[PDB]
Amino acid sequence: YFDHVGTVKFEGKSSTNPLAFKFYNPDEIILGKTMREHLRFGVAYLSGMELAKARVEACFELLNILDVDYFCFHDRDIAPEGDTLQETNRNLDEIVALIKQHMHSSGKKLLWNTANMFTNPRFVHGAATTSNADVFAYAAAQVKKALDHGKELGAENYVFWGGREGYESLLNTDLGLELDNLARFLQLAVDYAKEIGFDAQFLIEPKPKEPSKHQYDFDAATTLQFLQKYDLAKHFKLNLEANHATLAGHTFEHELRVARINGALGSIDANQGDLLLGWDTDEFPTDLYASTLAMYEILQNEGGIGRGGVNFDAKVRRTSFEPIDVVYAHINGMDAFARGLQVAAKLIEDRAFDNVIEERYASFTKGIGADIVSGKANFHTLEAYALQNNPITNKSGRVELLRSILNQYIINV
Amino acid sequence: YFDHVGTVKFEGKSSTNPLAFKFYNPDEIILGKTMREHLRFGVAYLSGMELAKARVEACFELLNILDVDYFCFHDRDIAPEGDTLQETNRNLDEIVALIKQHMHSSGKKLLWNTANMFTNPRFVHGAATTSNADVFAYAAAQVKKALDHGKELGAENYVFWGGREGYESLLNTDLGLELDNLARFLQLAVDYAKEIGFDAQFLIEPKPKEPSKHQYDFDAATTLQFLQKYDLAKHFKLNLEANHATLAGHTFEHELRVARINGALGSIDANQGDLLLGWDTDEFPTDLYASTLAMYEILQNEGGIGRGGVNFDAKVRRTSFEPIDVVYAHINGMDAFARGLQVAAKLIEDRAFDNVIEERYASFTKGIGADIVSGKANFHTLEAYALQNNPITNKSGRVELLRSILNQYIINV
Amino acid sequence: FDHVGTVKFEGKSSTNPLAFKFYNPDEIILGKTMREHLRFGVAYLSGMELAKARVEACFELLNILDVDYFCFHDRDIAPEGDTLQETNRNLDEIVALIKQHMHSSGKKLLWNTANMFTNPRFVHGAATTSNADVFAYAAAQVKKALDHGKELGAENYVFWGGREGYESLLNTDLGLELDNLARFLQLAVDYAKEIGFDAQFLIEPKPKEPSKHQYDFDAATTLQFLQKYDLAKHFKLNLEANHATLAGHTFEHELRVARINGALGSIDANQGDLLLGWDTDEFPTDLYASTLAMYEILQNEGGIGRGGVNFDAKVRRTSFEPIDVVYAHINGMDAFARGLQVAAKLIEDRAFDNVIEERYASFTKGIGADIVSGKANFHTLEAYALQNNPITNKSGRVELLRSILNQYIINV
Amino acid sequence: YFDHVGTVKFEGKSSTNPLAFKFYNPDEIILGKTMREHLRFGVAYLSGMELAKARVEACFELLNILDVDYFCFHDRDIAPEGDTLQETNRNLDEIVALIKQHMHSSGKKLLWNTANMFTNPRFVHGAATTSNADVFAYAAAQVKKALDHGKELGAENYVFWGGREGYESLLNTDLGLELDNLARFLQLAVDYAKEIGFDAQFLIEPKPKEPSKHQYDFDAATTLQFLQKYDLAKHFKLNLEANHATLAGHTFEHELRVARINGALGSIDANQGDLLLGWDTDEFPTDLYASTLAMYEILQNEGGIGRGGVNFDAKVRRTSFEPIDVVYAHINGMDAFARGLQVAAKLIEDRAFDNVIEERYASFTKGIGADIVSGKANFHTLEAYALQNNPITNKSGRVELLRSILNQYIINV
Ligand SMILES: [Ca+2]
Ligand SMILES: [Ca+2]
Ligand SMILES: [Ca+2]
Ligand SMILES: [Ca+2]
Ligand SMILES: [Ca+2]
Ligand SMILES: [Ca+2]
Ligand SMILES: [Ca+2]
Ligand SMILES: [Ca+2]
Ligand SMILES: [Ca+2]
Ligand SMILES: [Ca+2]
Ligand SMILES: [Ca+2]
Ligand SMILES: [Ca+2]
């Protein structure tokens, strides 16, 4: 299906073969784990049911071409809807059965599945946050079925994403009812997963906007505020998508670090936006700064990426319409994140940033700084200290110095 | 001296007097309350101490010119630093006593005061989130003094703003330590206000960025996430500044509604940015959509603006450098928000929006929708409902219709 | 449209949702009726059966709204065939039905255009394509549209951004693409001359979307291109409000730049959302933007001239009932009619012009007159400044002027 | 004084010396020319006259530390104003005499000088586009003096920059008069340079905004529209500043290519913005994509950078306040652009992009495409060709392929 016989192999950074990896060596050992284990790369997923069966075959062909172990899918992208909900689910069941056998034969694993509650017109007002309770019931039936399929196929995570949960205008929005109903829907899904013994990690993917004016899981901190408010934080981690970070006005590594220090870095969608375009372009990730600094955050996460992966939720350019461009595009993104891993790991091993940070904040490990951190110091004792009028000498933050190191490691590692 | 003898007075929407209110009639009653009480307008603040005393005289002259009942100040904006912290506080105490005098003779009240921990170079790395423990101690001494002065002058609120609390680069940032230390600082402040019996409402003002790349209290939701995480939410509401809403990628009314439904709409700074400029211009508020929709949110807040007010944290344009421009600018903003109050109050009384919202979400007050809201319905019963395959018919959201009504009321109320 | 009658003016107090609150087509404003000031335009089963039905729905909507002008794109009014010949046969057949409807209903064609955006052949652009075969098809399509524009009496003809730009400079021959864009536009000019097509040629700037950069980025950038290639004498601009803010400008900025360069040809009335980086094409509702747009248009030579105020806008995705098309045009028609009322009174009252006159009075006398005349040079200006006479600037009065704007929007 | 002493020297990519160039080897020959000549790096430029004289010393000390051959200055940055214009020019002349001798003894060259008509409050409304003719006269006297000084010191270019030439609001702007006066002023300057024999390349620096809402030289194409309209294009090239390109919504390499194909790539100011911050941050350039692609456009320019240079119009971060950070910051930017030159030259030498472009547009060098370029093809004949209905087959744009190549050369060159 992809104009490409054979598999893409690692050929080193000097190779001029456009169908070879320059940096992704799956077997390269980095800090005691292989690149394959560090990155856990995932790949995204005639008419009617015949087109669907052919899509199955093409998905696993591509997984074999790229030597990728993990895939993801949305229900409505693997099978067409029927004339009833029953027939929709029969069509899905049939295609799931084909996928399950391919997974067994090929040894491929389901990183996550999800429900597409975005495409069909019934979701024009959203799904959980719809104004039409009939749509909420259909959305529950659809996610119910998707949790069944996630359990059947052994999904390691299950994703809820922004779709159409937000608003076009606050003028016609009952904000409390929509947010309450979102929280009800998510808890109902948690209840159902527990009842069927589905032990995948639940993930929410923040997205700030597009196609809606505002979408409720705006960024990591906004989603965490909602999760904490509704007693859902214990059930959900975040699926962080690079382009959605920058759409929200943050760097990717900002979202990742916020997620990390709240125990909620669950998985990533590796792509990139165009910061001069206010929409979500979902380009395959090529920026070596973004991939280096993303893997820097991931490598410090408990268990690294953990049960998540580096998932290529990305779109070939409109002008890269040939089948082979799908292979070129993944090679672009896989080599960019493999280089990012190499560079990040060496930055971490050399404490290239950590030693500067240790020195920056050293005052909080001695004297009055230690007393602040320990809780001994209060406004009375801090004032008495400052009333000594000891000269205050700040230290440079060395931003340009560190930026030179980042450039040096990107090139030299 | 503002080149202006006497008071600005209401002269109706027909007046061509540039130094007269066209819409702010302080005694006009709207829904059982005067404009004065709805809006609770606030105004925000030779060398050395003589320049400082002159500035006090100019501030209360302006309060009298504008017939404004409330003012705000920052400590380092009202008095110069001395050669020691002791002398800085002596200078500040002397000016605070001159302010207390003018409050006596004029009856004007302190809406809030705050510590300016932005201007002096000791705060280059921040205040609570500084890398230098000596700066943390100075910041504590400064806020301790400001809480004393707030108590002494009867401040109804006390504001913490995000001046230097954030980062220039995550490369050199110990994020967890900075946020832990910000939470420690705010809790120490809470402790001290309780010890001295300072009963003002504590407020945090979100700001997403500028001057720094990222500032931690990015928007209402992000600040609420931090407050909830560190058990501080019970002590703080938000001071919402309109320009900071749009700088964060939200409308002002979005930030206000989010705060409102989390019980955290404490006060507002009334200004406006330029959405084509990304840098916090703090212009006086002139946009009648923004003022109407801000007042629409405030009127539905418990107690209206409550102990807060509509505070003109705004700057005349660089090209409006004459004294009289300060009066023109305030008339601009006071009339904009008075018109917004009139229009919003009639939109609420007529239920121009509430009737469309009521009909939009009516399905959640009966049938399967009521069972969703009550918790009776789960995935099993919702699926059984959806499996009936009853046709789903959504209703239009009528955005353009409501925008017509908004235009009509802004013009015709 | 689930609304059989005609929408009429019922004044500002009316609570009829299907009535104009500000657009009174007959109201006289500075010697001209609202109808002729604004020249409102409306922008336009399977296969040919669906095509014919859409013609009927178009003119049904023109009658509901009492609108005199319409626009269309060729590929939006007729389906393609299995050959170019068949595509033009389908197109000709629908054009014949539109012409009869124009005669019977009295409606006029503001402009037509060629849609060289949808079909996959234009993936790399039309005039700026990398594939010469596509350039040829593009020329054939515009040729046919110039013929239909002549046949239907189009007062303008529009070239718009579509796919003329780049996704990446890494693979772009910029000089060739711009040279070919100019070649294509000249050929079009050559052909309009042959058949006696007299309509005003217009270029619509768009800075980006779907592409990373589109070459007619804004008014000034398109003007730089037209001047470089000796095409400025043949083209004016079709200015769309959303494209101004997408380019980082206010709509009134683009309108004034176009106006002082004699290139304000026509407008597409809509609005974006300045918090969303994409071209939302909402029906215009912002009274500031509509007031200040009509302020610029009223000062253009002949007002909007041969152009019009064309509602190139889409209903919200959540406004999916037929009646919402009517509600949305009422929203935008009333917003721009109010804009005209306020702008005309501001102009009549010289509310801004008197302030501008005083602001720059220094350039009508003394050393300022010698600067303007060309008499003053660096030598005589230095001698003047070396007198060290005090410089006293005057306030720009921006906050004062904004209060006036608010007052007129509410009061006129 | 810069805490350094000695010269920064090249130590190669593996050095761990923070005070050594890792990529800038001034003597390395690349396509027949040294790095030093390719890049022509430029560096930017007690109270009263004593502080001014100390600044002269510190400037040339830094030029010797960095081994940089070119510098720039603004008149009001090198000498304080006097109590009269005569005194201002006497102060300026005295400092210019000191700089002239330093240039002779040190062998450093003046890349460009300019007039600062931004700081003093007389320019609150602008300079050439002021509303006050008295200010226009002062502006004329100041530029006249700067052209005198530029000729005396042998400036190779002379810069006009954005300052406050724009508007705060169109409500109070006579746009035609301001633009006419801008053109008059620039022609007066051209006249005067001719009269004194000043042979430097005149340059205009585009800037879209900040501090003003709109600045007239918005970007390259907008400035070119102005230069063509007023018959000034024959006299001016552009000084392209990287942060101003992105502030205007363009990439830096876009502005450079637009300048280059219009004969107007005169010089550059090498810095970078933050595309998530809406204001002009003027950070030292570190992004290897931006520096690579900028040197890519420059190397294809007639004569490369020509009489211009790669000028570091950049500011150290607020938090990098130690003197040594100035050295670290230039090492960061000089190594970034030296690496950019290495990578760009090999990309150009290998025709890594040019061969893909040659094939992409091959259709225009034969058949109907040649008739199009030749002018022979017209609408009648192109339609005849299209009416044969021959299959249209487009070829992929290969963007992801090309991005992989860019990444590979950045690492491997
Ligand atoms: Ca909603
Ligand atoms: Ca996306
Ligand atoms: Ca995703
Ligand atoms: Ca910090
Ligand atoms: Ca502000
Ligand atoms: Ca504030
Ligand atoms: Ca192109
Ligand atoms: Ca558009
Ligand atoms: Ca348009
Ligand atoms: Ca101006
Ligand atoms: Ca700059
Ligand atoms: Ca510059």
Side-chain angles (χ1 to χ4, degrees), chain C residues 119-346:
Chain C
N119 185 283
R121 75 176 64 86
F122 297 116
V123 65
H124 293 309
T128 63
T129 190
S130 46
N131 184 347
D133 290 348
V134 169
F135 189 110
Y137 187 104
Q141 188 178 343
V142 176
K143 175 173 175 324
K144 174 88 234 179
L146 297 173
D147 294 338
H148 285 149
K150 169 199 36 59
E151 192 187 336
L152 298 178
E155 308 188 24
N156 313 266
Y157 183 86
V158 168
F159 303 79
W160 53 297
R163 316 266 186 200
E164 316 283 31
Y166 60 80
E167 309 288 301
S168 169
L169 277 177
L170 299 181
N171 67 0
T172 297
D173 187 329
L174 183 55
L176 178 49
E177 287 196 20
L178 295 173
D179 291 345
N180 278 345
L181 180 59
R183 276 169 199 131
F184 190 95
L185 289 167
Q186 188 55 72
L187 301 182
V189 175
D190 297 344
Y191 187 82
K193 189 180 182 278
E194 289 193 30
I195 78 193
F197 191 29
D198 52 308
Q200 177 66 67
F201 272 22
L202 301 174
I203 292 166
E204 179 180 278
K206 189 175 191 190
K208 58 196 174 190
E209 200 281 304
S211 304
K212 176 175 173 64
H213 174 91
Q214 278 144 206
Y215 290 133
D216 301 316
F217 187 88
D218 55 15
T221 302
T222 307
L223 286 175
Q224 191 269 345
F225 164 88
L226 296 173
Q227 295 160 190
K228 178 175 175 164
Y229 286 101
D230 193 19
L231 289 165
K233 61 169 180 269
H234 303 300
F235 289 86
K236 296 179 185 206
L237 303 176
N238 192 55
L239 293 321
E240 181 178 323
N242 206 155
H243 298 185
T245 52
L246 224 56
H249 316 302
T250 61
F251 191 28
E252 65 269 19
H253 173 95
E254 288 293 277
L255 291 171
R256 198 176 294 189
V257 167
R259 166 162 77 71
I260 71 176
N261 284 277
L264 200 175
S266 200
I267 76 164
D268 281 353
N270 62 17
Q271 73 187 47
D273 187 329
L274 272 53
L275 293 163
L276 319 173
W278 65 92
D279 184 40
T280 62
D281 296 335
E282 301 159 43
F283 274 77
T285 194
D286 174 1
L287 292 166
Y288 296 99
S290 77
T291 293
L292 301 170
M294 291 313 299
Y295 192 89
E296 295 304 324
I297 286 161
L298 284 173
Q299 296 173 264
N300 200 39
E301 67 160 67
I304 200 69
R306 299 183 68 189
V309 173
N310 183 47
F311 290 102
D312 185 13
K314 302 120 192 83
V315 293
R316 302 295 277 251
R317 187 186 20 84
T318 53
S319 296
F320 47 81
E321 297 167 9
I323 195 57
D324 286 317
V325 182
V326 182
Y327 289 147
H329 283 85
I330 291 182
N331 175 212
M333 286 167 80
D334 268 346
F336 258 80
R338 184 48 172 191
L340 164 70
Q341 291 185 323
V342 178
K345 190 52 168 155
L346 289 165

Side-chain angles (χ1 to χ4, degrees), chain B residues 92-335:
Chain B
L92 181 54
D93 285 350
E94 189 176 329
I95 300 300
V96 162
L98 180 67
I99 289 171
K100 197 184 199 173
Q101 274 198 318
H102 277 90
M103 290 171 76
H104 294 336
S105 70
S106 76
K108 311 301 192 182
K109 291 168 288 169
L110 179 56
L111 183 68
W112 49 260
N113 67 311
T114 187
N116 186 314
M117 302 190 284
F118 178 88
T119 71
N120 189 276
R122 73 178 64 87
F123 298 119
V124 64
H125 297 309
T129 61
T130 186
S131 44
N132 187 345
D134 286 358
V135 171
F136 192 104
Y138 186 104
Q142 183 178 345
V143 174
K144 180 190 183 292
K145 175 93 233 164
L147 299 176
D148 290 343
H149 282 150
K151 175 176 170 201
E152 183 179 346
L153 293 182
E156 291 176 41
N157 312 267
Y158 183 86
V159 163
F160 299 82
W161 47 290
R164 305 270 188 214
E165 321 282 27
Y167 61 78
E168 309 287 310
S169 165
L170 277 180
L171 301 175
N172 67 357
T173 295
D174 184 337
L175 182 54
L177 175 65
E178 288 197 15
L179 294 173
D180 287 352
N181 274 346
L182 177 54
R184 285 173 190 122
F185 192 91
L186 295 171
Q187 185 61 250
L188 294 180
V190 166
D191 295 348
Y192 184 75
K194 181 219 285 152
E195 176 190 332
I196 68 174
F198 185 33
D199 302 293
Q201 175 69 63
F202 275 15
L203 304 172
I204 291 166
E205 175 178 285
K207 186 172 192 199
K209 57 187 167 199
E210 201 282 307
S212 290
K213 180 178 176 49
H214 178 84
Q215 276 146 203
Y216 291 134
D217 303 311
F218 188 90
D219 59 13
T222 299
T223 307
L224 288 167
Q225 192 275 335
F226 165 92
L227 295 174
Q228 293 159 201
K229 168 167 184 170
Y230 287 99
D231 198 22
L232 293 166
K234 65 184 138 183
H235 302 293
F236 290 85
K237 298 184 183 188
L238 309 176
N239 190 56
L240 290 320
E241 178 171 325
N243 203 155
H244 298 182
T246 53
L247 208 63
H250 319 303
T251 66
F252 193 26
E253 64 270 14
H254 173 96
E255 286 298 277
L256 294 171
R257 191 172 301 188
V258 164
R260 169 156 81 71
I261 68 177
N262 288 276
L265 202 173
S267 194
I268 70 161
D269 282 350
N271 62 18
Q272 74 183 48
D274 187 329
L275 267 55
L276 295 169
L277 320 170
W279 67 74
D280 194 46
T281 58
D282 296 334
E283 297 156 44
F284 271 79
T286 193
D287 180 346
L288 291 163
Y289 297 103
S291 69
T292 290
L293 296 176
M295 290 312 304
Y296 190 95
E297 294 304 325
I298 289 172
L299 288 173
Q300 303 172 260
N301 197 41
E302 193 274 347
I305 202 64
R307 323 184 56 183
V310 175
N311 180 52
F312 288 101
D313 185 14
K315 292 123 202 100
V316 300
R317 283 192 103 101
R318 185 176 39 74
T319 50
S320 311
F321 48 79
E322 296 169 14
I324 193 57
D325 284 324
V326 175
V327 182
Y328 288 153
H330 278 85
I331 287 164
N332 186 34
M334 294 170 75
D335 269 342

Side-chain angles (χ1 to χ4, degrees), chain B residues 276-277, chain C residues 207 217-218 220-221 244-250 253-254 257, chain D residues 162 165-167 179 182 204-210 212-226 238 240-241 243-250 255:
Chain B
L276 295 169
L277 320 170
Chain C
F217 187 88
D218 55 15
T221 302
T245 52
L246 224 56
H249 316 302
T250 61
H253 173 95
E254 288 293 277
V257 167
Chain D
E165 316 284 28
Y167 60 83
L179 293 173
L182 181 55
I204 291 184
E205 184 182 88
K207 184 171 202 202
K209 60 185 144 182
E210 203 284 297
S212 299
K213 174 173 176 64
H214 176 88
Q215 279 150 202
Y216 291 131
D217 302 318
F218 185 89
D219 58 14
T222 300
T223 304
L224 285 173
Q225 192 270 338
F226 166 91
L238 305 173
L240 293 322
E241 181 173 318
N243 202 160
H244 298 185
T246 54
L247 222 57
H250 315 305
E255 288 296 275

